[PDB]
Design a protein around this ligand. Structure first.
Ligand SMILES: Cc1c(N2C[C@H]3C[C@@]3(N)C2)c(F)cc2c(CN)c(F)c(=O)n(C3CC3)c12
Ligand SMILES: Cc1c(N2C[C@H]3C[C@@]3(N)C2)c(F)cc2c(CN)c(F)c(=O)n(C3CC3)c12
Ligand SMILES: [Cl-]
Ligand SMILES: [Mg+2]
Ligand SMILES: [Mg+2]
Ligand SMILES: [Mg+2]
Ligand SMILES: [Mg+2]
Ligand SMILES: [Mg+2]
Lengths: 637, 702
DNA sequence: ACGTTGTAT
DNA sequence: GATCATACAACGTA
DNA sequence: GATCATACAACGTAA
DNA sequence: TACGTTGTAT
């Protein structure tokens, strides 16, 4: 009874049904459409605790799962008629459902075995990946109440599957274990590699697979090319589309988030703006992508930033390295979730942003932790990798000292230990205050030292080398950071890559991006010079050209025959303004043609010779490093 | 509780700051000097602690924490335990900041008189703009000061960037310190009360914060229509700007379009986003975001709530917005999904306010920051002020206008055009009265309704429609803004108390086919349900009354109570003015094109000479004007002519376009010359719009 | 004395 | 992303 | 519009 | 050894 749960009037377990909703917005919609005669609704605000390794008392401690036990009416000792798990048809809905299956299997085994647990099947357009078409349905929160009933609640038109067989009781209790075990993380990763009414063992496996693979590919793991996660990539592109360049005026962040959510990113607003705040804080990102006005947090409390309604943002000058060459046919374009617009799959990075800024993410079965590096050092290293492709990691380490965090603290890790980090791909680096380390709160540090001062462990402080060495190991003045160079490569699969594999693989992405840029510019220079050629022919024969237009009824074929010109050439003559007949506009055309002719052969030459293109890459990397590069902040020793 | 405390305890150097926004308060705590500055954010508005008792002030959590932080009890003469030296009221520079300040002054004047009289209360002056040109940075608390800085920088290289602060929440912590917190560069005025001014200060503030003295405030608005500062001069000017602001820029609607500013900025912003009735739905969060960033600098919740109301068919007679998702239900109108979940779009009825927008029919004023332009009104093809009606609460006055039927109001406007001497008695035969979005009947008599539309004020009553079937009462339609669940709870509560022992059961059969169906079963047929029904009409919400106060901002730009004849008569003046502006606008477009088409035909007839002039003369624009006696605007059209247009077919297309435009030229000039010809147009458009958007009467009158 | 209404904090 | 408490006019029922 | 609790991978810290 | 962190997600 207790709790914000809609109760049903009838008490006949044979006809009564209880529904567990994922979103509170969807729950409100479910309460409006439920049949009070035999339908009960309970909203589950947010995700539910993974009550698999939690004790019986711990399950009752969590407010969400506790209220679930009260509504169901069964205690976790296994001592309404149908309990239906109703969640959206998105990767999290399957995740929230799996967490509820783990709750019903371990603590309420009598409920799942008796057949009182159900799984609601919402439509996508057709729950499959459009497999029948070869022969968009908004989420439950965005669905109308009447549509939500015809889809999940109304028995005459719903799709409800009944969720442990006698022979499957062994595999159901074993499959879910490896899936929902915190320690069995390696068991889940190796399970994905192999994997790369309704049974409870078949549902949990398929459900957790879609979420595990989705979270890695479409959230936590970044793309090697632009070094951005999908949510990160969709933010920068939407800001460029909104005209929020470095020269434009600031715009309220709420509008930017609103467009990102409605256009490309169908997820929560808080998670999106938090990613925007991270890209804007100079103390969190080495080379921020966003510049904003207002309260964007402080080094002591990075989370103490004003709401998106009070802050105005705009892209930074550094962000131009990812979008300046976007519209020049350099990247593929895929449709968005609903398909009404197009989104770029990648961003043309003039510099390897994956190593410059670095990203730390947590996925299912795997994680990623990449530290930031200096711009001029990584740029000069990429230039050297173009000159001598056989360069070794030891030779590269001489150029790039190591990570460069947005702090003036010193890195105490030895050069020999750093070499092992970039060689094996995994490791940890340590920093010591000179300025506090990265993601170290100044206010928090004072509280730690004050507690030591209160106990009287350092009575001389109102000689310091001995005290400092003690505080480095006791307080946060010395902190380490784990390094796990994991990322989604060009092959579309995650893999741990060393420093040499990253720089080598990114230059392949850059050479491909430039090769696509040159083809784009070539077609514009060639077609324009092709159009201007016809104009001069028309200029020489304006008398005949104009006479043909005025006399002939349909001049499009006639113009092609009289001068042997192409259909596209004729349209340019027909679209010529009388103002262009002046002698000055002819000289302007003759001048424009002389310049364009020089550029035409250059693009075909660079695309033909690998040496000529490599010299360009070596030039662009140095040019971008001289403008956006900066000195080393955190020294390595 | 949530108060940042200072380490020092010296009252001579200690200062306390009261912030209006919690976001701004957090920013103030980051920039405060912990040595002697303490900050406490005041979430939301503060209780009007003028007529509240000393115990009531301690009951409200907001003001209670203020007394604890200050260290003085609401009993005067308690300054012996004061914690801080200076009490500063820090609020944003929008009209509410002056309101929040006045509410804090009322708290300090009545309950903490020792603080204000001793001179420990201060008023912070935040800046309105931030001008930066290079290393130099200046602030501008007033608009007259902003231009002064811009004019001063005109002699300096660079383009100054004028940054207007929407509020303390949008300011940087470092910027907030240099302006309000840092004593070396802040602007803090001392609010003191002289000995002789104590009588007027205690009297002036009373009329402003007195609940009963509402009429005294209304006549006060009509008449009103340094290091230290007196509190009677500050509170009077502060509350005046808020009182006038709320009337003009919030609650009271404009007679022309019948919309409040927030409503108009929503409908206009949606038209700019292409959200016409035919376009696809867009997430409401996007619409609200644009409305806030473009035109409406206020809270997001209050704006989206106004959008939701305009979309609910059970709240608006003719909704302006059509949406998908959970937009609430008649039982719980507030049970609507958040703006991030709902997608909206303008309704077909909204076309009556925007179809003529781009046709030069309304004035355009700049927005708050001046970067965009906003329409002052919307060209309403029908008087939306009476169709939808708006309920508002202002300072000193309020407005409550009920909805009416479209076809009835249109026919009344048509009749007033034909016979301008038509009386209200003749109009009441056309317009029965209010028409709510419910099938419940209006029980007010026609004679009592006539007094409502004549005096402008009054009240109407509605009663639920019911019919007893199978010996049991069945309620089919409830009054307007009457919740079915609330009605059932009231009747059930009476059943629980034993005040209705004759009724057997109380069921709610409301389904998707029948919107409202409440059944009341008696214990026997001998029980008279007519006697029980009459009791429930007086006991439950089955019978509800609605206040009527036809107050609105007229064309003269001033609020006034207007009767039914003054509304339709004043709107027809607004409509005739907008149509007269539409025709002049289209006329000027037809004239300018005919002036351009004239030059093209001249060029076609002398194409040989025209081209020869272009090739020979370096700049042919003047030569063309002299050789053919054509105008500069005509020459530019000739120069921008494509060679394809020299074909004989494209000439015939222009001669045909001219023959049609010449017909449209004389037609518009004829309607603009004769008032009778224009009245027949208005009489036609009103009937045309009524046949398309009009609908039957929903709430019957009996 | 309370409780409504709707734009505002 | 549901939950809190206020201003303002003013009438209607407990 | 500040405040609430969870999933997911594994380092470090003092236990 | 459980516990605290980290950042996109509900
Ligand atoms: C309701 C929800 C929370 N509830 C509170 C408690 C019942 C819970 N177990 C889940 C929460 F604690 C935090 C949030 C946050 C904060 N990052 C959100 F941005 C947000 O949009 N949601 C909803 C998208 C889930 C939140
Ligand atoms: C914080 C705030 C509320 N608190 C709750 C309790 C601390 C208080 N004394 C004030 C509230 F009860 C409601 C709101 C609403 C809802 N109409 C807002 F839109 C909003 O932006 N704020 C702030 C603009 C004021 C709200
Ligand atoms: Cl035209
Ligand atoms: Mg979802
Ligand atoms: Mg404000
Ligand atoms: Mg709500
Ligand atoms: Mg309210
Ligand atoms: Mg967290």
């Amino acid at each position: 009874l207790p709790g914000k749960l809609a109760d049903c009037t009838a008490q006949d377990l044979n006809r009564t049904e209880l529904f567990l909703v994922e979103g509170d917005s969807a729950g409100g919609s479910a309460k409006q459409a439920r049949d009070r005669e035999y339908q009960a609704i309970m909203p589950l605000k947010g995700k539910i605790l993974n009550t698999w390794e939690v004790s019986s008392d711990e399950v009752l401690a969590s407010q969400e799962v506790h209220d679930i036990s009260v509504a169901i009416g069964i205690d976790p000792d296994s001592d309404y008629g149908k309990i239906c798990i109703l969640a959206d048809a998105d990767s999290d809905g399957l995740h929230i459902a799996t967490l509820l299956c783990a709750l019903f299997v371990r603590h309420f085994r009598t409920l799942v075995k008796e057949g009182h647990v159900y799984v609601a099947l919402p439509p996508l357009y057709a729950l499959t990946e459009e497999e029948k078409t070869g022969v968009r349905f908004k989420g439950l929160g965005e669905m109308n109440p009447m549509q939500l009933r015809e889809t999940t609640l109304d028995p005459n038109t719903r799709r409800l599957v009944q969720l442990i067989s006698d022979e499957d009781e062994q595999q159901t209790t074993a499959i879910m274990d490896m899936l929902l075990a915190k320690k069995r993380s390696e068991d889940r990763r190796n399970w994905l590699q192999e994997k790369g009414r309704l049974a409870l063992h078949e549902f949990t496996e398929n459900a957790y697979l879609n979420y595990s693979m989705y979270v890695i590919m479409d959230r936590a793991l970044p793309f090697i090319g632009d070094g951005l996660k999908p949510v990160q990539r969709r933010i920068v592109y939407a800001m460029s589309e909104l005209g929020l360049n470095a020269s434009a005026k600031f715009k309220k962040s709420a509008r930017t988030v609103g467009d990102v959510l409605g256009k490309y990113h169908p997820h929560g607003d808080s998670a999106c703006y938090e990613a925007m705040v991270l890209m804007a804080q100079p103390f969190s990102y080495r080379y921020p992508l966003v510049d904003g006005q207002g309260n964007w947090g402080a080094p002591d409390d990075p989370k103490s930033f004003a709401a998106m309604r009070y802050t105005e943002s705009r892209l930074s000058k550094y962000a131009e390295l990812l979008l300046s060459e976007l519209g020049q046919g350099t990247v593929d374009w895929v449709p968005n979730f609903d398909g009404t617009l197009q989104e770029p799959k990648m961003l043309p990075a003039r510099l390897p942003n994956i190593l410059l800024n670095g990203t730390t993410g947590i996925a299912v079965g795997m994680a990623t932790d990449i530290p930031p590096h200096n711009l001029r050092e990584v740029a000069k290293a990429a230039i050297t990798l173009i000159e001598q492709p056989k360069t070794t990691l030891d030779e590269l380490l001489d150029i790039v000292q190591g990570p460069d965090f947005p702090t003036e603290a010193e890195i105490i890790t030895s050069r020999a230990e750093i070499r092992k980090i970039y060689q094996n791909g995994r490791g940890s680096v340590r920093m010591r205050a000179v300025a506090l380390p990265h993601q170290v709160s100044g206010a928090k540090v004072l509280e730690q030292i004050a507690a030591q001062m209160r106990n009287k462990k350092l009575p001389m402080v109102d000689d310091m080398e001995q005290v400092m060495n003690h505080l480095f190991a006791t307080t946060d003045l010395e902190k380490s950071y784990r390094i796990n160079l994991n990322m989604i490569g060009l092959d579309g699969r995650p893999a741990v890559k060393n420093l040499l594999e990253i720089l080598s693989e990114w230059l392949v992405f850059r050479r491909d991006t430039v090769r696509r840029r040159l083809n784009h510019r070539l077609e514009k220079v060639l077609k324009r010079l092709h159009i201007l050629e016809g104009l001069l022919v028309a200029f020489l024969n304006i008398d005949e050209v104009i006479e043909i237009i005025r006399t002939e009824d349909e001049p499009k074929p006639a113009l092609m025959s009289r001068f042997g010109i192409s259909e596209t050439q004729a349209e340019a003559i027909l679209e010529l303004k009388l103002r262009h007949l002046a002698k000055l506009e002819e000289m302007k055309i003759r001048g424009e043609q002389s310049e364009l002719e020089k550029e035409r052969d250059q693009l075909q030459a660079i695309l033909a010779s690998e040496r000529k293109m490599n010299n360009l890459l070596k030039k662009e990397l140095q040019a971008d490093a001289d403008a956006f590069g900066d000195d080393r902040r955190s020294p390595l020793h």
